[PDB]
Design an enzyme around this catalytic site. Structure first.
Site, PDB file in Angstrom:
ATOM      1  N   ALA A  64       0.827  -1.179   0.000  1.00 50.86           N
ATOM      2  CA  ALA A  64       0.000   0.000   0.000  1.00 50.86           C
ATOM      3  C   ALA A  64       0.884   1.259   0.000  1.00 50.86           C
ATOM      4  O   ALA A  64       2.010   1.322   0.611  1.00 50.86           O
ATOM      5  CB  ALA A  64      -0.900   0.091   1.251  1.00 50.86           C
ATOM      6  N   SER A  65       0.345   2.333  -0.578  1.00 46.86           N
ATOM      7  CA  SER A  65       1.108   3.583  -0.644  1.00 46.86           C
ATOM      8  C   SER A  65       1.635   4.119   0.685  1.00 46.86           C
ATOM      9  O   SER A  65       2.785   4.552   0.813  1.00 46.86           O
ATOM     10  CB  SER A  65       0.266   4.615  -1.354  1.00 46.86           C
ATOM     11  OG  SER A  65       0.077   4.058  -2.667  1.00 46.86           O
ATOM     12  N   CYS A  66       0.793   4.059   1.707  1.00 43.47           N
ATOM     13  CA  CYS A  66       1.177   4.498   3.045  1.00 43.47           C
ATOM     14  C   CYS A  66       2.301   3.673   3.680  1.00 43.47           C
ATOM     15  O   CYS A  66       2.976   4.217   4.563  1.00 43.47           O
ATOM     16  CB  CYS A  66      -0.032   4.610   4.011  1.00 43.47           C
ATOM     17  SG  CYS A  66      -1.188   3.218   4.213  1.00 43.47           S
ATOM     18  N   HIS A  67       2.578   2.456   3.140  1.00 44.70           N
ATOM     19  CA  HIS A  67       3.697   1.607   3.649  1.00 44.70           C
ATOM     20  C   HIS A  67       5.016   1.882   2.887  1.00 44.70           C
ATOM     21  O   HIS A  67       6.110   1.186   3.091  1.00 44.70           O
ATOM     22  CB  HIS A  67       3.428   0.115   3.535  1.00 44.70           C
ATOM     23  CG  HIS A  67       2.254  -0.369   4.282  1.00 44.70           C
ATOM     24  ND1 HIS A  67       1.639  -1.590   4.015  1.00 44.70           N
ATOM     25  CD2 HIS A  67       1.508   0.255   5.228  1.00 44.70           C
ATOM     26  CE1 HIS A  67       0.527  -1.662   4.759  1.00 44.70           C
ATOM     27  NE2 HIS A  67       0.427  -0.553   5.490  1.00 44.70           N
TER      28      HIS A  67
END
Ligand SMILES: *Cc1c(COP(=O)(O)O)cnc(C)c1O
Ligand SMILES: *Cc1c(COP(=O)(O)O)cnc(C)c1O
Lengths: 399, 403
Positions: B344-347
């Site tokens: 995911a982008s936030c990771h």
């Protein structure tokens, strides 16, 4: 043409701000957290806007946290203060009786739920200003935050934030002597931005609320937090992906942030200009209103010896048939309000803020708030004064 | 020159959405709470958008609450549930939540925070290590006397696996009749539908949920969102996180962001009118992509979005090419055309810890460490798929070649 005099309710967007939002939608659409260039690009617009906001208020970029608007910013400071108290008997707050709904209601809610105690210090019924002594007298060992609006939205009165911060800083020394932590100070500056200079070192505050749509920017906002995570604690309301250094998670709204940044740049570049123009048009308006209405008008924003926003003129015309919402219904050109835009559902009631300021009930029932803007002209003032004359004739009749 | 295949991270705005935001900024700038024509026109854009969102999900306008994005919507349902359990008791000790182990950070983290602060108890039901799906019987088996909310994502963002939301709701509906008979609280059901909207039909009557999260930037809309609450105020309560000026019937106060709402509504209209076309287009492209990846890498590739017996998003292909040198972030760093992500982008801030979501799903660490998530979109073509399969072959060769 209508003539808009409700800029304290909201402002149109400056063309440069509309352009920045549009450019960003089209060109900087990538997730700002993404590793590739598309991501780093939006992140750059966000960093630039963070610096723009900090420059507008004389702070540093790392002290700015972006939010969805002033309501979230105000609720966040309050929420954070409760959590801070629990990580250090209920926390106590000090505020005043003419705060916006987004400071008053979350505090009333904490009280109803028995989570915190709050002293709603009354304002002076003489100068519509909260008095510093009343704030200092309200401090308790459990007091954690003083939150007082920089400028009132209905009257335009400026509160003595600087003096409050100075006096609270002194008390904080003695408090530490007894091992008591510091009382912090927040100011809701929604109505001051772009109308008078705002400088965090001059104000002395630990938190400050920024509302874009009050200074020709988009409907988002931010929170200034003095040396956040170092000098001042901030505990989040939201949990998620790590954005805004985990103080405010969620994929950043790059286009809105670009526009808030551009709006902030215009305030940095032109604040004194905007101020001078607003003052000039508002004083002209008050001169004309007094010239047309004489002893029948009461100027509700001219409290003695206190500073007030340059653009605001809250007024009432004597007469039983001149309730504010009825006067405005009869006007054909003027667009204004009788109080907070968010209070538009109870306009047949006298403003509780004006009541709190010692304005008589019959005068408050007739109150109309005129707030001018960057484009307002003297020809427009003349047109709405004429409009007000015909509306008053229709309702009260000649006297 | 670049080929974007990270539509699960974010989507560009459709031109019509951009036009809607721009006109609203210029023409409907009035405060929606204002009592004059400037304020009533923005309120009207807001009303039309609310009906647009409701139509997109098979619901009614009154059951839509605008929010700042998916994170807020998700945090709001969790917060409201805590408040609701408490109001019901007072009107009469900790509420219990059931979720799964592969939810988005905006569902997992607020729940973990509730457990750390001893405000609620939560069972994080493990998904199946055979099919990457949380199972209906495991969710039912986790029900407690104080359970009041089951929140399960409709689609997982990393693998694309679809969770059995309809069956979960049907089973919980039957269970609630038994709880009523004995006086127990009813268990409500929420689904974070962030990754399903615009990629498969989403219908709240089919899904049977009480709450549903809507995220604009996953369906070519602006970076705001909404929360569907069934029969809000009549069948389902919603206790606010924010207090202020009365907007959104006091469920979410603050002056309404009309331009963003306009954009969100237009994005929803496109989903309502064209979802089947988007879905079928995505599926053809993604299936061509898997064919091509297998044709080029053969037995060296592992397709991580091909779980047995379950449905998956039509656009998602998570894959790993075997090799010590082919960690996902290393593969993508060598790519010159492809734009994708390792999870995911936030990771993105930890591109080197093998995905916890894939490990939960039974993907062994050697495969998880090398995973890359490709997610195609409305405009992706088969020719673009060939460009990035070529880009990937080149990257792999650089990584395994001379030093
Ligand atoms: C994108 C997404 C969300 C919302 O995240 P935001 O950063 O607030 O846009 C929530 N759940 C899932 C599964 C998502 O993919
Ligand atoms: C406008 C305003 C706010 C913010 O209200 P929003 O509806 O969230 O934009 C806060 N405080 C004051 C004094 C305001 O005038």
């Amino acid at each position: 043409r209508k003539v808009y005099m409700d800029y304290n309710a909201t402002t149109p967007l400056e063309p440069e701000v509309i352009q920045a939002v549009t450019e960003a939608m089209k060109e900087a659409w990538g997730n700002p957290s993404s590793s590739y260039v598309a991501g780093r690009k939006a992140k750059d617009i966000i960093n630039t806007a963070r610096a723009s906001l900090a420059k507008m208020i004389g702070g540093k970029p790392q002290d700015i946290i972006f939010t969805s608007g002033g309501t979230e910013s105000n609720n966040l400071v309050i929420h954070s203060t409760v959590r801070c108290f629990h990580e250090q008997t209920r926390p106590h707050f000090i505020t005043c009786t003419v705060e916006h709904d987004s400071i008053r209601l979350p505090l009333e809610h904490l009280v109803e739920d028995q989570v915190a105690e709050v002293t709603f210090v009354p304002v002076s019924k003489v100068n519509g200003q909260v008095e510093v002594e009343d704030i200092l007298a309200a401090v308790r060992p459990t007091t954690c935050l003083v939150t007082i609006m920089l400028a009132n939205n209905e009257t335009g009165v400026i509160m003595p934030i600087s003096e409050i911060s100075r006096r609270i800083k002194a008390l904080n020394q003695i408090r530490a002597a007894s091992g008591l932590p510091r009382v912090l100070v927040h100011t809701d500056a929604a109505q001051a931005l772009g109308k008078r200079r705002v400088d965090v070192e001059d104000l002395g505050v630990d938190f400050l609320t920024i509302v874009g749509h009050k200074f020709y920017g988009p409907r988002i906002g931010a929170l200034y937090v003095r040396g956040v995570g170092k000098l001042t604690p901030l505990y989040p309301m939201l949990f998620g992906g790590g954005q805004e250094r985990n103080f405010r998670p969620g994929t950043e709204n790059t286009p809105m942030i670009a526009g808030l940044g551009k709006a902030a740049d215009l305030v940095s570049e032109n604040c004194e200009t905007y101020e001078a123009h607003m003052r000039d048009i508002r004083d002209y308006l008050e001169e004309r209103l007094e010239a047309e209405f004489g002893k029948r008008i009461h100027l509700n924003s001219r409290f003695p010896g206190v500073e007030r926003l340059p653009n605001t003129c809250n007024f009432s015309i004597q007469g039983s048939q001149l309730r504010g919402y009825m006067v405005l219904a009869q006007c054909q050109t003027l667009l204004a309000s009788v109080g907070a835009s968010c209070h538009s559902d109870h306009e047949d009631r006298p403003s509780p803020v004006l009541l709190s300021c010692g304005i008589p009930v019959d005068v408050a029932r007739n109150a109309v708030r005129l707030s001018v803007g960057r484009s307002t002209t003297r020809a427009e003032v003349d047109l709405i004064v004429q409009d007000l004359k015909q509306a008053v004739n229709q309702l009260e009749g000649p006297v």
